[PDB]
From a paper:
The structure of [name] contains an N-terminal helix (residues Q43-I51), the catalytic LD-CPase domain (residues V65-K201), and the C-terminal [name] domain (residues K208-Q325), each connected to the next domain by a single loop. In summary, we show that helical shape in C. jejuni depends on both the LD-CPase and [name] domains of [name].
The likely catalytic triad (C174-H157-G158) is located on the central stands β5–β6. The [name] domain contains three helices (α6–α8) wrapped around a curved antiparallel β-sheet (β8–β11), which together forms a cone shape domain with a broad pocket. Regions of high sequence conservation are observed on one side of the molecule, focused in two clusters. The first cluster is in proximity to the catalytic triad in the LD-CPase domain. The second cluster is formed by 17 primarily aromatic (41%) and charged (30%) residues that are clustered in the pocket of the [name] domain. In the wild-type [name] crystal structure, the average B-factor of β9-β10 (residues 292–310) was 53.4 Å2, 1.8-fold higher than the average B-factor over all residues. The conserved CPase active site and [name] domain pocket are ∼40 Å apart along the same side of the protein surface.
Residue numbers in the entry: 40 to 325
Write the structure that this text describes.
């Protein structure tokens, strides 16, 4: 059933999956770089609630971030770390670090870091789009409320450039069916089906291997024809804003496997697009 889109459509039902479909409760920090609005939404079993909002925020520069020093705020889907104290009053009372660069950023060769949500200089110095070095600044008098809303939660960061990016039920359902079809192909050492879920042109890796060599490597590995038992859990699927006019999603999950002497849980992440035929194509894989 898990390989059928309509099974997932039934599971999703009337849930609000516009900011993603999550196995458990999460918060989503949604920033739009054109609107200069940051909102925090809680997701509870498909019910969305707006818990925080500030308008007239300061972000970094427009455009897709590429390198250390370009001053741009990254567009995409990230995670937020716990409140911390920079120890420099320039950042306001405290800060929260986003995970820029993520795996997709890295395999695309992007550089930089230090993309945080923080406040304003305690001495009153003004901020502008050039001074945050890509960080997102909220007024200090709103940061206590922001901190309370994100405290002790699993918190994601969704940053749009201009267009409003929302997940669609049909896309989440089709991707979940593709995910479990890809899982079955790996389980059965079915090289051809497995490889059909990778973008022959755009899939990128740390080791810079091209698709032809990746295909032959996987066929070699799969030739062991090992009997495998694998379970996915804690699946989170999220829409992925981008400036390439692609329908992209992030899929994260735990990979579980029992061994006669150990049960292993490992974190998996796929960054994917939906191709013109409606099929998942993996662009980066942990």
């Amino acid at each position: 059933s898990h390989m059928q889109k309509d099974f997932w459509l039934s599971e999703i039902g009337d849930k609000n999956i516009s900011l993603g479909y999550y196995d458990d409760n999460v918060a989503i920090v949604l920033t739009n770089k054109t609107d200069k609005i940051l909102r925090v939404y809680s997701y509870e079993d498909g019910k969305i609630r707006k818990d925080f909002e500030q308008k007239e925020i300061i972000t970094g520069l427009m455009g897709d971030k590429k390198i250390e020093g370009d001053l741009k705020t990254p567009v995409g889907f990230y995670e937020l770390g716990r409140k911390f104290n920079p120890g420099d009053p320039y950042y306001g009372p405290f800060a929260f670090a986003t995970t820029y660069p993520n795996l997709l950023d890295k395999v695309q060769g992007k550089t930089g870091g230090g993309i945080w949500i923080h406040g304003y200089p305690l001495d009153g110095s003004r901020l502008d789009e050039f001074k945050t070095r890509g960080c997102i600044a909220l007024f200090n008098n709103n940061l206590e409320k922001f901190a309370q809303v994100v405290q002790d939660k699993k918190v994601f960061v969704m940053t749009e450039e201009k267009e409003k990016i929302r997940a669609k039920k049909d896309q989440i359902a089709s991707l979940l069916a593709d995910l479990f079809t890809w899982k079955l192909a790996w389980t059965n050492s079915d090289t051809n089906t497995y490889l059909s879920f990778y973008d022959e042109q755009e899939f990128k890796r740390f080791d810079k291997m091209k698709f032809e060599q990746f295909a032959s490597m996987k066929k070699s590995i799969f030739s062991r024809k090992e009997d495998k038992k694998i379970k996915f859990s804690d699946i989170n699927i999220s829409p992925y804003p981008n400036l390439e006019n692609e329908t992209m999603y992030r899929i994260s999950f735990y990979e579980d496997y029992y061994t006669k002497n150990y049960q292993f849980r490992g974190d998996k992440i796929l960054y994917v697009k939906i191709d013109s035929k409606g099929k998942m194509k993996i662009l980066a894989e942990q």
